[PDB]
Amino acid sequence: SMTSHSWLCDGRLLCLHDPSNKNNWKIFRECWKQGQPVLVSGVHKKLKSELWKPEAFSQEFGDQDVDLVNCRNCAIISDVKVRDFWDGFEIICKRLRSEDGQPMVLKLKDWPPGEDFRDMMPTRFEDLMENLPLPEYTKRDGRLNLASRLPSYFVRPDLGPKMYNAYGLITAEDRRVGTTNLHLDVSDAVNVMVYVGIPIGEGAHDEEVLKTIDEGDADEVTKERIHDHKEKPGALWHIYAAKDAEKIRELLRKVGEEQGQENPPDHDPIHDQSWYLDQTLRKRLYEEYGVQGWAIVQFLGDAVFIPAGAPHQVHNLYSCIKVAEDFVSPEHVKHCFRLT
Ligand SMILES: [Cl-]
Ligand SMILES: [Cl-]
Ligand SMILES: [Cl-]
Ligand SMILES: [Cl-]
Ligand SMILES: [Mn+2]
8 A cells, every 4th residue: 555654774764655745744844853864765756767867968968078086996087078987887898997907986076067957957957856855845945945045144055956976886895985975064955866777797796785785784674675676776875963973073083093094183084074984883883982873775766865964975886876955944054053
């Protein structure tokens, strides 16, 4: 039977089932006011799927110049063509190679650049913004979005959306690396999985995806979504409550010292965006600092709501296209205020 919602993370995570339900706000707002993230499934079924394929991004924009990042080592690959990224998205043999002659795991940096999404891709912008869940919170002019209503005493987000495009991580060594490192934002965000590309040529790395989710600390209901429904899994997230950020800073300052980094006692390891919390660091955060997170697997069409001030990291299981919009909910406006 169709249901309004379910729970993940052993009851700590709301999952809404109908992205366009005019009553979602009544369930959402009680979880959101406590500083929890929220998951909304099924947004892919509202979108024009032909607008979100990698082949169409290559055909229409392939001649633009861009930089990429090598996710394994943080190296920047300067001033290449955007088709060099898209044409290897799903076909491994077509990927750029490192000196070792392996195909690289790559992320496309800042594309479309700055606030240009709307200008470059007007039809995609319409399709996304018209189908965001919780529209009174997430639309530019929604009645519960304060982004356009605050004076300069508050940090206001840029005009979005922002696109996040990157290959999936592959090997047992890759399990310790991020697509996006641990960091926080002063605004609220909604991030949608609009496309998941499951490769071919070295397509058979299905078993290291299972070990990654297991060791990622995912719940038994999330493990059922794979085996039972055959939905396409994109990315493994870890999110932490805004109130735990300083304990996470304290762990990461201790670890930097142990690893002979040399840093002033005040420096901000979260703001540096230089860390990925692997199984060892997550266990140490729980045991030694008493901090528990939410481990979330974002499938095709899932929308992740990230609260202002919440530290978070992302690890792509397969090749993904994500589109995110920032907003300022009244519940969390404290987090972008410039005083006390
Ligand atoms: Cl809060
Ligand atoms: Cl467009
Ligand atoms: Cl709403
Ligand atoms: Cl990063
Ligand atoms: Mn982010």
